[PDB]
Amino acid sequence: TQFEERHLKFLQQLGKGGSVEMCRYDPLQDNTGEVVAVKKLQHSTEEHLRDFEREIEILKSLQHDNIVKYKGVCYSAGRRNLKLIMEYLPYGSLRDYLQKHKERIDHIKLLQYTSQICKGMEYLGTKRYIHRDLATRNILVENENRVKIGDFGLTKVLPQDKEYYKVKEPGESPIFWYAPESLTESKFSVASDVWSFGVVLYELFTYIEKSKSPPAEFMRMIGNDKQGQMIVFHLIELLKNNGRLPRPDGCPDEIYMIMTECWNNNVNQRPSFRDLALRVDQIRDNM
Numbered sequence: 206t207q208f209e210e211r212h213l214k215f216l217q218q219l220g221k222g223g224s225v226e227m228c229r230y231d232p233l234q235d236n237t238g239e240v241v242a243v244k245k246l247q248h249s250t251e252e253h254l255r256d257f258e259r260e261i262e263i264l265k266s267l268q269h270d271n272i273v274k275y276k277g278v279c280y281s282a283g284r285r286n287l288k289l290i291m292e293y294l295p296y297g298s299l300r301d302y303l304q305k306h307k308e309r310i311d312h313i314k315l316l317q318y319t320s321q322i323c324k325g326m327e328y329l330g331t332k333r334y335i336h337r338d339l340a341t342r343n344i345l346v347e348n349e350n351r352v353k354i355g356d357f358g359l360t361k362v363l364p365q366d367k368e369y370y371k372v373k374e375p376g377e378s379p380i381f382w383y384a385p386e387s388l389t390e391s392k393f394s395v396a397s398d399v400w401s402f403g404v405v406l407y408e409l410f411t412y413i414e415k416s417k418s419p420p421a422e423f424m425r426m427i428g429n430d431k432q433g434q435m436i437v438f439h440l441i442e443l444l445k446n447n448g449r450l451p452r453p454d455g456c457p458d459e460i461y462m463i464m465t466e467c468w469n470n471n472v473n474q475r476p477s478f479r480d481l482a483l484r485v486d487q488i489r490d491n492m
């Protein structure tokens with residue numbers, strides 16, 4: 206079913222990454238239409254538009270309880286700019302949600318969120334997609350009991366004959382979530398996503414405390430005097446030498462062990478998302 210641009214009523218800006226807005230799709234013009242989330246490009250050039258259409262095809266191919274729902278696309282006349290229409294997830298970003306309710310979210314709830322992120326990622330892998338940007342900033346909360354992976358802007362499809370994707374000219378790079386091989390060789394795979402997942406687990410159990418964030422902690426370890434390209438250089442050498450993020454205060458042993466397993470320099474030794482979801486669900490059952 207189609208979405209007429211004239212009937213999308215702006216309500217509120219939700220966030221920037223392009224941008225995401227809260228809109229009411231109101232063709233009856235009586236303010237009773239559905240509230241949706243709309244993603245559009247800030248700078249809709251020819252290369253970005255091509256990348257955005259691929260992102261849209263990726264999201265449309267995905268149907269999982271822990272992946273934000275695709276609703277449709279809005280086309281503009283002439284130049285062919287695109288708006289991606291998604292379900293509105295009313296509790297917002299996990300990052301803000303956890304910052305707002307801090308420790309009032311207990312470990313068993315955090316593990317319910319962990320399990321769901323794991324399941325969404327495992328599914329993504331069966332499609333041979335690499336997310337590349339797994340972080341709490343890309344997770345949304347539908348309700349108290351359900352989170353969803355909510356943005357796929359950096360997602361690549363693996364080539365048929367390879368188990369990695371090599372990025373030739375990197376743009377946006379969340380280096381503090383990157384596996385060593387991604388920093389050194391710009392190589393991305395299911396194993397690099399698992400590394401990133403360990404960082405997500407660190408994020409949840411620090412309750413996204415500002416001074417404990419991955420950027421804060423890694424900068425401390427390499428020295429706050431490191432700048433620009435030198436950060437990447439020193440980060441690589443630190444990770445090669447087993448410098449890791451510390452255990453979050455109050456974090457259960459069995460969860461901290463999962464993080465450190467994800468952060469294995471040896472790509473082949475990192476666990477699979479299938480094995481992670483089983484392990485996490487066993488922890489929850491024990492508790």
Ligand SMILES: C[C@H](Nc1cc(-c2c(N)nn3cccnc23)ncn1)c1ccc(F)cc1
Nearest residue numbers: 219220221242293294297342343344355356
């Ligand atoms: C950058 C963007 N920021 C948002 C987004 C939303 C939001 C929402 N409430 N529902 N929804 C549905 C699809 C996309 N975004 C959303 N809420 C708050 N902040 C952002 C975009 C995707 C992410 F995964 C995270 C943040």
